[PDB]
Design an enzyme around this catalytic site. Structure first.
Site, short mmCIF file in Angstrom:
data_model
loop_
_atom_site.label_atom_id
_atom_site.label_comp_id
_atom_site.label_asym_id
_atom_site.label_seq_id
_atom_site.Cartn_x
_atom_site.Cartn_y
_atom_site.Cartn_z
N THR B 1 44.93 51.39 46.96
CA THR B 1 44.19 52.45 46.19
C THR B 1 44.59 53.01 44.79
O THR B 1 45.76 53.07 44.44
CB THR B 1 44.11 53.63 47.15
OG1 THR B 1 43.57 53.13 48.36
CG2 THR B 1 43.18 54.75 46.68
N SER B 2 43.56 53.38 44.02
CA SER B 2 43.69 54.30 42.89
C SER B 2 42.73 55.49 43.08
O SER B 2 41.52 55.29 43.22
CB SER B 2 43.36 53.61 41.56
OG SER B 2 43.96 52.33 41.49
N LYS B 33 36.23 56.34 49.75
CA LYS B 33 37.52 57.01 49.93
C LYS B 33 37.43 58.51 49.65
O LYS B 33 38.39 59.24 49.89
CB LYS B 33 38.55 56.37 49.01
CG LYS B 33 38.68 54.87 49.20
CD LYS B 33 39.65 54.25 48.21
CE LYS B 33 39.78 52.76 48.47
NZ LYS B 33 40.84 52.15 47.63
N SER B 129 48.49 53.46 44.79
CA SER B 129 49.30 52.41 44.15
C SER B 129 48.95 52.20 42.68
O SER B 129 49.84 51.93 41.86
CB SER B 129 49.14 51.09 44.90
OG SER B 129 47.79 50.68 44.94
N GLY B 130 47.67 52.31 42.34
CA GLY B 130 47.20 52.12 40.97
C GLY B 130 47.48 53.27 40.02
O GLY B 130 47.38 53.10 38.80
#
Ligand SMILES: [Cl-]
Ligand SMILES: [Mg+2]
Ligand SMILES: [Mg+2]
Ligand SMILES: [Mg+2]
Ligand SMILES: [Mg+2]
Lengths: 195, 196, 241, 250, 222, 243, 204, 244, 222
Positions: B1-2, B33, B129-130
């Site tokens: 994800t970002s 999300k 993570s992004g």
């Protein structure tokens, strides 16, 4: 612990059990009796983990003696063996299992027949003409496959047993300090003093 | 994800990509999300899909029961319930959640809740993570009291870059606008955002 | 005669504690009424504030159980609030467990089951309340379901509860004999509220100011209560016709 | 706090009676009449729908209830007690049978489980007995069609035909004259409607009468097709219109 | 058994003639990522105590709530809550120390190093340390993490033993603390330039300084 | 009969006589009041001086819940303390989960449900206290009064104890004469007057006055006891009115 | 120390024309040591036959358990349990020990007494039902049995012909497995007669 | 508290009797009579159904006689619902013994345990006792054929012939008169039916008001068979002895 | 295993292959992976075979009880909620991976559930070891506004991709069509493209081939 044998002949069951108790590099005792009388015509030998063996044997002994007093009656060898199997079958899935292997030799007075049961710590029961636990079987089973006959006398059974002990004393790595031999027949349980 | 959430003049906007992952295989390329825990309190989910879903479901239940007894909960209250679940079950959870809501008294508010279960109130928040790849960009471009159009462009440009560099991010850019006017859902496709 | 103190059978097969709980129902001396429109379900109840020192805004017997379900109580307020809190909790748990809003009739059954337990188990007394649940159900449409201390429950075309319930009941019966239908054939909820107040005025024979009434309205996707000025607006409309 | 009533509320009196059970049966006597008749190819259970108010919608209150696809129940006595017994009965059919054997319990055994629940309310701490008698009709492969009565004590008896509640004494006598071992299901429905008219006072139509059957499998009521062994529920509730059709040729 | 996620670095402190000084930077680190910059790691309890916390921030926020609750609970049925029966620094410490050691004994610790700085009712200076293991100790100067290695040596040059405390003024003490904070910014890879500082004096009371910056830095020498 | 021997048993009227008996214990207690004002609430209570040996100012009866709620009660004092202990537990768990301090209406129902629970079983006794309580939250000021049955409402003014009727009459006059509202400092003075006027119903032993208040402007929305100059000023105002 | 291969053994079941067959070896050992050559692995409860391979203590325990459960079934139901129903009972009982399972490979075989249909089924240690028209295999020589059955089997075999096929499937499979053999038993099952035959096989 | 409503089911009278046990026995004395007779080659169980209705389904019915295992059955007198609770416990207990020892449970052991459960309800727990008396009929290889009875007190005894329920006094006298030790099963069948026919409160004993069962070694060689009689078989045995 | 689900005009269709394996061995050549939760709600399950069967039966049992309790036809979101909370509680130890589909009063629905407890939504989904082969087909040929006969074709084509290209999948194609307003239509062995060819030889043995030591009649009667 270590060596426990059993032979069923025409009229009796004979159990032989090693006398040694070893801990580390010391034989602490050379006259140990690895057996308990469960009832007048039923004998149980045992081998396995230290402490566990006697604790289990005496626990079973207490239960069968309790049954005997309650009903004023002696359980058949088959019934005792089934009770013992179930206790070990419970034990194997406990937090700390009993690591004990047993042989049960009995004379069924209703059938007038000797009976020998082999049960391991998992609760694996089998009726046999001859039995052994641990490394002993790797020598004695083939020996008995050859020399055993189903119609042998108690004397013939003892000679057949001498042949097993001799082989074990020749090829086994450890000194097990001989055996205590006991006979189970119509007249109950008695010990052979000169073996 | 970002994922990210940004406060502005009229309220707050939440943003997220749509990629779900099991190793290098994209299990779902159209994921949502952005999740509703109350009429005008929403959250962005990052980390384990199963953990974040179970948490958001429990929170939604708690706020529904809060509303039944005490009326509309504050955004701070919603964040506290998320925190309580994340903090007390820190050993068994992998969840990075951003909470965002609109009050009429407090206007737009953003709370971020990282792995440990700590709470941090901020003007805007980025996570997943992004997010690592856009700390520089976002710090340089964020201004307070932006307009709706400016904030949409800020999120669109930011997540565009996060998606560009992070393999764990991609698909569409979903957004949710929280103002006095109501709740607006926006979607932006690759063909638009990729060539920004 | 200890068979009258706890919920065990009397020689004639009756439960006196349940029967006496029914009598506690009227202890507040308040009458309630519920009707159904095409799109809505309206519930109205009398509001009596005797003490001048009371804050009138805190005196209420209508409760918002969930977003879609409303509940009016006939009985003492402590037991009323006890039932309300449980209903709210039950409706919240249902949504969490089963992924959709608890229907009005299902909540009614659940609360009725709880009441049944108090009639069978000794250590728990029955609640001295009658609970009227209203909603616009997404499957069954406008719905009225009512619970009592015996654990009984059933759906209604319309209903009334309180000391002067029978007068209101027959008044409604006679209207539905005339109209030949199961509901109020009206478009807006405003006029269904007007119908409800009009027919309560006729049955009870009393006039109402804006502070003598309490109104709850259920529409698709929300249940809400009316303010004093919303009711006043409604009272003016009745008077000018 | 906590349930301090850990002792029995039903106890033996000097004469040997169990007071609360007797008083529960008295509550059943007051209850509205319900009946059951067993035919060669089916079973019928019926009862009057006593409306509490004409503003009440009696369709929302179901006295005849499906327990399994092949088993139905009706009662006389206290409605709330019956309602929770149906909930418990439906659950026990799953927990203590279907979740173990992958099929629905035979009538006699489900009846046995309901009877157990009712027996425990007669002996356990701090509870009164259930104030209902049940009539349970059902079918299973190895026993065929059957009809059982369950009393507040927990006792159950199999019946060819019977009635319980208000006018049960007269209704049982009526059924003794009409019942034979060659009755077809339609003949049993006809007799059920005749027997019920005697005990009903007011309106007698499909809206005031509740009636269900245990008969042939209904593939149209299954909800799906493709599995040959699954053929549909044998329990069917007759509609208001279906009752009125039979009341003309009465 | 835990692992810390969002963390705070050094907390430093010392005694002077009339009271105690304590300081800690405003950073919430996420591994090597310097993630949060508005984090207050000094928490006052009343007007006579400041608790400085390093380590896991989620656990810090939990300890905040415990102290907040302790003030509430102490006020209950207590007419002298703002006088003779107000919370002393020694009470606040012993409570935290108890909790820390109990949590370590349940193999689920609060992942923190804590310094309680304050002034007792009789005017005595209070300064004591406690950590995730429940280990406690006191000294004229106390510091956590990197502070223990770099700040303590500097602060011990001002107050090396007990007899040096009366000879040390608040001006001299604050100067040493502020200098130590600069040294930590030079040398700790998880420090920030921004920090908070608190003075608890027996005469002037609690002075809480926010948004302080490290300044007068030497780099010009590569 | 025997319907009054056991709690939770309905009489043929539909009444719980054990609760009504608990109300008698409340009526026996000393007078306590609550006045709602412009931006807060004021609480006051009568403390009977049984003996010279009682230390003045040192047997405090008004209790604080959280930091924004005040509670006072009449009847069995220990029962009131039990209720406040529960109130403090309820308020703590609310603040723990939801962060914000418990709203007054929310807090009122927590006490209400708990007291109502003590009318459901024969193994517990109903509470022997009526409790006047309130404070300031996000929606302004709220005053409540809770009775042994679990019944509670919001109030403009509230009174309970041996001099409740005297105090109620005096409260009604304030509501009529001040439709726009009463100030916090005024309400403190009035509270003193009303306790002194309500003391006529308990005039064998002389008494000690105790006042507390919560106000958005005067106490910053927190519960504080009225002491020193403000207390003596309120006592003097009351002394002037009885003569 | 792999529980399913300490003792050794195999079971196989087949369907024929209005009949079913179920067969097993006689070996019980402790890894390399052969201990018993009389250890049968097929049991029956009424007309329903159950074969169990795996850890021998669990084989014994489960037999005793299903005897227990089918005895209570018969007392309450007043009829013998059918193969389809017993199959479901075995599945339920095994899944009850989901996170502490019996290390077994059971096989159900029998003829439904109402419909007359031949029925066989197999399970994993955790309860998964495996239904088959043709054959079910289990034990330490299951790979071998799968190969023998897949090639030798044809549908609608007569009882006498089915005996030859299932016997040859077991024997040749057992001889390629160190832990299986030491004797064999075959059960031929018709609607209302069951014949049990002990096979002559190599004893190594 | 709740003390007010406690009957105190497990206390002694001043005379040293247990109220609830005595009253439960009084209940059982109104239940249909059940008889057990033990012969040298089998056992008979005979019981009278409680006043029957003509519309009762007689063939698919069980009220008096229940099967515990293949070797043991019971005749019931009292509350049927209570009896089924105890019967299911007894059925489970028999299977526990078989599972443990791989032998069918000896009759006395099963009887003792069921009786011990009844005893518990009279000494602790504050609950009413089970209003049930059993006649146990069974076989094992230690004592052969055996009859036992247990009652709500939890006391049990062994018998050659015995009755429970209604009219036991009259029934026992008649059994004591015509019973002898060398008796056969077919003779015992006749004695059982003759006794019920004379002690019955009904006008005449018919097939539809009876349950009947035998436990013989009349299978094929050294094994025991339980025969729960069908309606038509009771009709035939009633004609064969000339009662109808 | 290969399993898919596809939405269309007036409902939803699911499909699966029919191979069951234990390691590289094929245990069942025609197992049924399409399960019934309620009449019009069907499940396709991959992963641990006993877990998918047991979890589908348990929730199916509870759904039936719920339907009877509420007097309503069961909803797909209820089955979804119950499955997901059960699977989450066991932290992935119950290895059930499911595609849940069906019609109810709310409309037609298609979801998937992972063993740890996450759910997904889609117009087209695929699970199992052959999910990548299936998804490749679905991504290539899916479009908005599919007809019934188009969706069946797409679904079975996606399953065929798995059958031919995935070693975990094989044998036949099962299909279930759930259309709004109609009965769910289960199509067992909708396609059978893997029929075993005629064997070259009959392996029927001459009678007497097998050596026998003992014969005996077995008593099955009482
Ligand atoms: Cl319920
Ligand atoms: Mg990317
Ligand atoms: Mg009660
Ligand atoms: Mg081999
Ligand atoms: Mg070999």
């Amino acid at each position: 612990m270590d060596i426990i044998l059993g032979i069923r002949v025409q009229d009796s069951v004979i159990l032989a059990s090693s006398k040694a108790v070893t801990r580390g590099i010391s034989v602490l005792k050379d006259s140990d009796d690895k057996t308990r009388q469960l009832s007048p015509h039923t004998l149980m030998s045992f081998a396995g983990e230290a402490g566990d063996t006697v604790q289990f044997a005496e626990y079973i002994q207490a239960n069968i003696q309790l049954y005997s007093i309650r009903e004023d009656y002696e359980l058949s060898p088959q019934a005792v063996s089934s009770f013992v199997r179930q206790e070990l079958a419970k034990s194997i899935r406990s937090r700390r299992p009993y690591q004990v292997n047993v042989l049960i030799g009995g004379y069924d007075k209703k059938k007038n027949k000797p009976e020998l049961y082999q049960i391991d710590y998992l609760g694996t029961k089998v009726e046999l003409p001859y039995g052994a636990h641990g490394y002993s079987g790797f020598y004695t089973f083939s020996l008995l496959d050859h020399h055993y006959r189903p119609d042998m006398t108690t004397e013939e059974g003892l000679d057949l047993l001498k042949l097993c002990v001799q082989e074990l004393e020749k090829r086994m790595p450890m000194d097990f300090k001989g055996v205590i031999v006991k006979i189970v027949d119509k007249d109950g349980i008695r010990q052979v003093d000169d073996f | 994800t970002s994922i990210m959430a940004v406060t502005f003049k009229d309220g707050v906007i939440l943003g997220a990509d749509s990629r779900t992952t099991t190793g290098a295989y994209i299990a779902n390329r159209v994921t949502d999300k952005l999740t509703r825990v109350h009429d005008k309190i929403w959250c962005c989910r990052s980390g384990s899909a199963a953990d974040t879903q179970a948490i958001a479901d429990i929170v939604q239940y708690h706020l529904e029961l809060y509303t039944s007894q005490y009326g509309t909960p504050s955004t701070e209250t919603a964040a506290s319930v998320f925190k309580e679940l994340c903090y007390e079950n820190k050993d068994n959870l992998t969840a990075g959640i951003i909470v965002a809501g609109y009050d009429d008294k407090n206007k737009g508010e953003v709370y971020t809740i990282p792995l440990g279960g700590s709470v941090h109130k901020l003007p805007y928040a980025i996570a997943g993570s992004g997010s690592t790849f856009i700390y520089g960009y976002c710090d340089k471009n964020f201004r307070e009291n932006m307009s709706k159009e400016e904030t949409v462009d800020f999120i669109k440009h930011s997540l565009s870059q996060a998606i560009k560099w992070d393999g764990s991010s991609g698909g569409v850019i979903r957004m949710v606008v929280l103002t006095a006017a109501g709740v607006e859902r926006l979607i932006f496709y690759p063909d638009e955002y990729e060539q920004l | 005669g200890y068979d009258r103190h706890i919920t065990i059978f009397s020689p004639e097969g009756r439960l006196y504690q349940v029967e006496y709980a029914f009598k506690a129902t009227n202890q507040t001396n308040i009458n309630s009424l519920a009707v159904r429109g095409k799109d809505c379900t309206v519930v109205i109840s009398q509001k009596k504030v005797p003490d001048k020192l009371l804050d009138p805004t805190t005196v209420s017997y209508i409760f918002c159980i969930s977003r879609t379900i409303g509940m009016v109580v006939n009985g003492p307020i402590p037991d009323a609030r006890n039932a309300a809190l449980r209903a709210k909790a039950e409706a919240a748990e249902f949504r969490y467990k089963y992924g959709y809003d608890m229907p009005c009739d299902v909540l009614a059954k659940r609360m009725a089951n709880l009441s049944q337990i108090y009639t069978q188990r000794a250590y728990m007394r029955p609640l001295g309340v009658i609970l009227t649940f209203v909603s616009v159900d997404e499957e069954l449409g406008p719905s009225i379901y009512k619970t009592d201390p015996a654990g009984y429950y059933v759906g209604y075309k319309a209903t009334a509860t309180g000391p002067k319930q029978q007068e209101i009941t027959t008044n409604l019966e006679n209207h539905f004999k005339k109209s030949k239908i199961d509901h109020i054939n009206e478009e807006s909820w405003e006029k269904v509220v007007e119908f409800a107040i009009t027919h309560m005025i006729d049955a009870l024979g009393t006039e109402f100011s804006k502070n003598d009434l309490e109104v709850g309205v259920a529409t698709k996707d929300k249940f809400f209560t009316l303010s004093a000025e919303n009711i006043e607006e409604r009272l003016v409309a009745i008077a000018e016709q | 706090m906590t349930d301090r009533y850990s002792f029995s509320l039903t106890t033996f009196s000097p004469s040997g009676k169990l007071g609360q059970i007797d008083y529960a049966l008295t509550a059943v006597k007051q209850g509205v009449t319900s009946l059951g008749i067993k035919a060669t190819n089916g079973v019928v259970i019926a009862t009057e729908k006593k409306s509490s108010s004409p503003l009440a919608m009696s369709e929302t209150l179901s006295k005849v209830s499906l327990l399994t696809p092949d088993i139905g129940a009706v009662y006389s006595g206290m409605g709330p007690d019956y309602r929770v017994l149906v909930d418990k009965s439906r659950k026990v059919a799953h927990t203590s049978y279907k979740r173990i054997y992958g099929e629905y319990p035979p009538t006699k055994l489900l009846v046995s489980e309901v009877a157990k629940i009712m027996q425990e309310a007669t002996q356990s701490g701090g509870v009164r007995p259930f104030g209902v008698s049940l009539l349970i009709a059902g079918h299973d492969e190895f026993n065929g069609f059957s009809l059982y009565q369950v009393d507040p004590s927990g006792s159950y008896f199999p019946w060819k035909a019977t009635a319980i509640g208000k006018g049960s004494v007269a209704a049982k006598t009526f059924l003794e004259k009409r019942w034979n071992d060659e009755l077809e299901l339609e003949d049993a429905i006809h007799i059920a409607l005749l027997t019920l008219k005697e005990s009903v006072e007011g309106e007698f139509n499909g809206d005031t009468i509740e009636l269900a059957i245990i008969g042939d499998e209904n593939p149209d009521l299954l909800g799906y097709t493709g599995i040959p062994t699954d053929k549909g529920p044998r329990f069917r509730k007759l509609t208001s219109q279906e009752i009125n059709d039979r009341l003309e040729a009465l | 058994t835990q692992q810390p996620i969002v963390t705070g670095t050094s907390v430093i402190s010392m005694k002077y003639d009339n009271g105690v000084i304590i300081a800690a930077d405003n950073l919430g680190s996420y591994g090597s990522l310097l993630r949060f910059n508005g984090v207050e790691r000094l928490i006052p309890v009343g007007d006579n105590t400041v608790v400085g916390i390093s380590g896991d921030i989620s656990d810090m926020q939990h300890i905040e709530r415990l102290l907040k609750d302790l003030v509430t609970e102490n006020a209950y049925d207590n007419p002298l809550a703002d006088a003779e029966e107000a919370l002393e620094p020694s009470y606040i410490f012993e409570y935290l120390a108890t909790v820390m050691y109990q949590r370590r004994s349940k193999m689920n610790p609060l992942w923190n190093a804590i310094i309680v700085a304050g002034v007792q009712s009789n005017g005595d200076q209070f300064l004591r340390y406690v950590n995730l293991l429940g280990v406690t100790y006191s000294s004229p100067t106390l510091a956590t993490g990197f502070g223990a290695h770099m700040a303590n040596p500097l602060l011990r040059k001002v107050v090396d033993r007990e007899s040096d405390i009366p000879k040390t003024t608040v001006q001299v003490a604050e100067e040493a603390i502020v200098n130590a904070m600069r040294v930590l910014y030079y040398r700790d890879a998880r420090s920030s330039r921004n920090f908070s500082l608190a003075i608890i004096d027996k005469n002037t009371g609690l002075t809480f300084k926010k948004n302080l910056q490290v300044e007068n830095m030497k780099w010009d020498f590569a | 009969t025997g319907y009054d021997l056991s709690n939770s048993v309905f009489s043929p009227d539909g009444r719980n006589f054990q609760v009504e008996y608990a109300v008698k214990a409340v009526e026996n207690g000393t007078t306590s009041i609550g006045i709602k004002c412009n931006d807060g609430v004021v609480f006051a209570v009568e403390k009977l001086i049984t003996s010279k040996l009682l230390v003045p100012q040192k047997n405090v009866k008004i209790q604080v819940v959280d930091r924004h709620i005040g509670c006072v009660y009449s009847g069995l004092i220990p029962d009131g303390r039990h209720l406040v202990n529960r109130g403090r537990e309820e308020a703590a768990s609310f603040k723990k989960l939801y962060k914000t301090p418990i709203p007054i209406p929310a807090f009122a129902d927590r006490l209400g449900q708990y007291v109502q629970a003590h009318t459901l079983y024969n193994s517990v006794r109903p509470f022997g206290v009526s409790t006047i309580f309130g404070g300031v939250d996000k929606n302004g000021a709220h005053l409540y009064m809770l009775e042994p049955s679990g019944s509670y409402w919001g109030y403009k003014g509230a009174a309970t104890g041996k001099g409740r009727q005297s105090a109620k009459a005096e409260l009604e006059k304030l509501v009529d004469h001040h439709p726009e509202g009463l100030s916090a400092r005024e309400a403190v003075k009035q509270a003193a007057k009303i306790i002194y006027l309500a003391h006529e119903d308990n005039k064998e032993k002389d008494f000690e006055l105790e006042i507390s208040w919560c106000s958005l402007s005067e106490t910053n929305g927190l519960h504080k006891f009225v002491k020193g100059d403000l207390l003596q000023e309120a006592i003097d105002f009351a002394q002037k009115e009885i003569n | 120390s792999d529980p399913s291969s300490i003792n050794g053994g195999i079971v196989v079941a087949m369907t024929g024309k209005d009949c079913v067959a179920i067969a097993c070896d006689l070996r019980l050992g402790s890894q390399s040591l052969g201990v018993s050559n009389k250890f049968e692995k097929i049991f029956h409860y009424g007309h329903v036959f159950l074969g169990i391979t795996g850890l021998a203590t669990d084989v014994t325990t489960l037999n005793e358990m299903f005897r227990y459960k089918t005895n209570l079934y018969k007392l309450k139901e007043e009829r013998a349990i059918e193969p389809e129903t017993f199959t479901q009972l075995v599945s339920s009982s095994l899944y009850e020990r989901r996170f502490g399972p019996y290390f077994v490979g059971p096989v159900v075989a029998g003829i439904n007494s109402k419909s007359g249909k031949p029925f066989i089924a197999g399970f994993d240690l955790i309860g998964c039902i495996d239904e088959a028209k043709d054959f079910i295999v289990s034990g330490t020589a299951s790979d071998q049995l799968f190969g023998m059955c897949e090639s030798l089997y044809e549908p609608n075999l007569e009882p006498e012909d089915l005996f030859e096929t299932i016997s040859q499937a077991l024997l040749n499979a057992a001889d390629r497995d160190a832990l299986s053999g030491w004797g064999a038993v075959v059960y031929i099952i018709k609607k209302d007669e069951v014949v049990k035959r002990y096979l002559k096989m190599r004893q190594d | 508290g709740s003390r007010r409503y406690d009957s105190r089911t497990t206390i002694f009278s001043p005379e040293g009797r247990l109220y609830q046990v005595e009253y439960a026995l009084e209940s059982i004395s109104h239940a249909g009579t059940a008889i057990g007779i033990m012969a040298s080659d089998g056992i008979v169980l005979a019981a009278e159904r409680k006043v029957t209705s003509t519309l009762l389904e007689q063939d698919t019915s069980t009220e008096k006689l229940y099967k515990l295992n293949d070797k043991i059955a019971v005749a019931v007198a009292g509350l049927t619902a209570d009896a089924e609770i105890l019967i299911n416990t007894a059925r489970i207990h028999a299977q526990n013994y078989l599972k443990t020892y791989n032998e069918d449970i000896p009759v006395e052991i099963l009887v003792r345990r069921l009786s011990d459960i009844k005893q518990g309800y009279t000494q602790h727990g504050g609950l009413r006792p089970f209003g049930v008396s059993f006649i146990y009929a069974g076989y094992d290889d230690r004592y052969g054929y055996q009859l036992y009875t247990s009652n709500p007190s939890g006391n049990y005894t062994g018998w050659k012939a015995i009755s429970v329920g209604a009219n036991t006094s009259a029934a026992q006298t008649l059994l004591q008169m015509d019973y002898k030790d060398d008796m056969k099963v077919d003779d015992a069948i006749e004695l059982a039916l003759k006794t019920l026919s004379k002690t019955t409160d009904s006008s005449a004993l018919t097939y539809d008001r009876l349950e009947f069962a035998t436990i013989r070694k009349g299978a094929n060689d050294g094994e025991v068979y339980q025969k729960i009689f069908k309606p038509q078989e009771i009709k035939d045995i009633l004609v064969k002895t000339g009662i109808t | 295993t290969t399993i898919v689900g596809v939405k269309f005009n007036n409902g939803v269709v699911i499909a699966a292959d029919t191979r069951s394996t234990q390691g590289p061995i094929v245990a069942d050549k025609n197992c049924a992976k399409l399960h019934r939760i309620s009449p019009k709600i069907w499940c396709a399950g991959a992963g641990t075979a006993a877990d998918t069967e047991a979890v589908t039966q348990l929730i199916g049992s509870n759904i039936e009880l719920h339907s009877l309790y509420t007097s309503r036809e069961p909803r797909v979101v209820s089955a979804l909620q119950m499955l997901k909370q059960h699977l989450f509680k066991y932290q992935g130890h119950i290895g059930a991976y499911l595609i849940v589909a069906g019609v109810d009063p709310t409309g037609s629905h298609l979801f998937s559930i992972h063993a740890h407890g996450s759910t997904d939504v889609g117009y087209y989904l695929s699970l199992g070891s052959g999910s990548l082969a299936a998804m490749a087909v679905l991504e290539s040929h899916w479009k908005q506004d599919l007809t019934k006969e188009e969706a069946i074709k797409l679904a079975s084509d996606a399953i065929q991709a798995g059958i031919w290209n995935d070693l975990g999948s094989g044998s036949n194609v099962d299909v279930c069509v759930m259309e709004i307003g109609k009965d769910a239509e289960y199509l067992r062995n909708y396609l059978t493209p893997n029929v075993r060819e005629e064997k070259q030889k009959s392996y029927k043995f001459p009678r007497g081939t097998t050596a026998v030591l003992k014969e005996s009649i077995v008593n099955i009667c009482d």
